Amino acid sequence: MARCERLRGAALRDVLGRAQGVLFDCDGVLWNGERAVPGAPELLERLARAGKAALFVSNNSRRARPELALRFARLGFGGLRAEQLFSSALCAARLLRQRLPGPPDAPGAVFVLGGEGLRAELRAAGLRLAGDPSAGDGAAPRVRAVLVGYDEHFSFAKLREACAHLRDPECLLVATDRDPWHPLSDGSRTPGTGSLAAAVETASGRQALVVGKPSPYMFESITENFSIDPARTLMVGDRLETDILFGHRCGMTTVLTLTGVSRLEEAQAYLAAGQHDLVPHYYVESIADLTEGLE
Ligand SMILES: [Mg+2]
């Protein structure tokens, strides 16, 4: 059970040693905006050398996987497979693929609130999108899902159209994630998908199926590919309500890093109130502190 203990010394060598793999959130963990966390690339190197699997889990739905993978090299994390990176955009496409309720002849079109990167991910999964060029000579395909992603061009009209589609109770409502906002380099903040999801949910009177963290689906999507043991896996993140909760639901050992959104103070407060799902097992100032555990 989570005690929010600072991970160091003997315990750190025991935890890392027994760990068969590490799942990393990206923003606020590996980097902050234009700046990599010093020692983070070295940690990933040593993990590889120690035979421990590193996987990456991001709620990003703004860039498709190939472009998202570019950030790793850009910020000094070389030698990484695209297959190591899991994003809400990627997992949302796969979930729609699995769940679109249309007949095999026409599984249904997806109405997307989001950018070109997200649309690219969806098409690559073989998904038909509303707004795409119609066949012929032919009507517009029936919309069977609304997907809410990070939409920098969100609008009242798009909100209204989303509601029109959701008038059909058989139409799915899916959101890539529920992150309410994100910190920017200048200290400001940008609205998150969670804020757009709140509007669609409220206007339509429906609850969205959430793909990304802290929903366990992305982990199930990871197990789809690799065989990993949650009991032997670390989940490292900077955001309590997203990353740590995620780790708890998946049965992973959770590590909060302090280089991101959440503060030690919040973690300790949750512990006081006895909300153990939001309490990390361990914390470190930055993931650069984990490296000594590999000796
Ligand atoms: Mg983060």
UniProtKB/Swiss-Prot annotation:
Expressing tissues: Ubiquitously expressed (at protein level). Highly expressed in all the regions of central nerve system except the spinal cord. Also expressed at high level in liver and testis. In fetus, it is weakly expressed in all organs except brain.
GO cellular component, as recorded: cell-cell junction; cytoplasm; cytoskeleton; cytosol; glutamatergic synapse; lamellipodium membrane; postsynapse; ruffle membrane
E.C. no: 3.1.3.16, 3.1.3.74
MF-aspect GO terms: heat shock protein binding; magnesium ion binding; phosphoprotein phosphatase activity; protein homodimerization activity; protein serine/threonine phosphatase activity; pyridoxal phosphatase activity
Free-text cofactor note: Divalent metal ions. Mg(2+) is the most effective.
Residues the entry annotates as binding Mg(2+): D25, D27, D238
SUPFAM superfamilies reported for this sequence: HAD-like
Residues involved in substrate binding: S58, N59, N60, H182, K213
UniProt note on regulation of activity: Inhibited by NaF, Zn(2+), Ca(2+), Mn(2+) and EDTA.
Primary location recorded for the protein, binned into one broad class: cytoplasm
Pfam families (UniProt xref): Hydrolase_6, Hydrolase_like
Protein keywords: Cell membrane, Cell projection, Cytoplasm, Cytoskeleton, Hydrolase, Magnesium, Membrane, Metal-binding, Pyridoxal phosphate
BP GO annotations: actin rod assembly; cellular response to ATP; dephosphorylation; positive regulation of actin filament depolymerization; protein dephosphorylation; pyridoxal phosphate catabolic process; regulation of cytokinesis; regulation of mitotic nuclear division
Xref: InterPro entries: HAD-like_sf, HAD-SF_hydro_IIA, HAD_sf, PGP_euk
Function: Functions as a pyridoxal phosphate (PLP) phosphatase, which also catalyzes the dephosphorylation of pyridoxine 5'-phosphate (PNP) and pyridoxamine 5'-phosphate (PMP), with order of substrate preference PLP > PNP > PMP and therefore plays a role in vitamin B6 metabolism. Also functions as a protein serine phosphatase that specifically dephosphorylates 'Ser-3' in proteins of the actin-depolymerizing factor (ADF)/cofilin family like CFL1 and DSTN. Thereby, regulates cofilin-dependent actin cytoskeleton reorganization, being required for normal progress through mitosis and normal cytokinesis.
Subunit comment: Homodimer.
Family per similarity comment: Belongs to the HAD-like hydrolase superfamily.
Protein name, UniProt field: Chronophin
Gene name of the encoded protein: PDXP
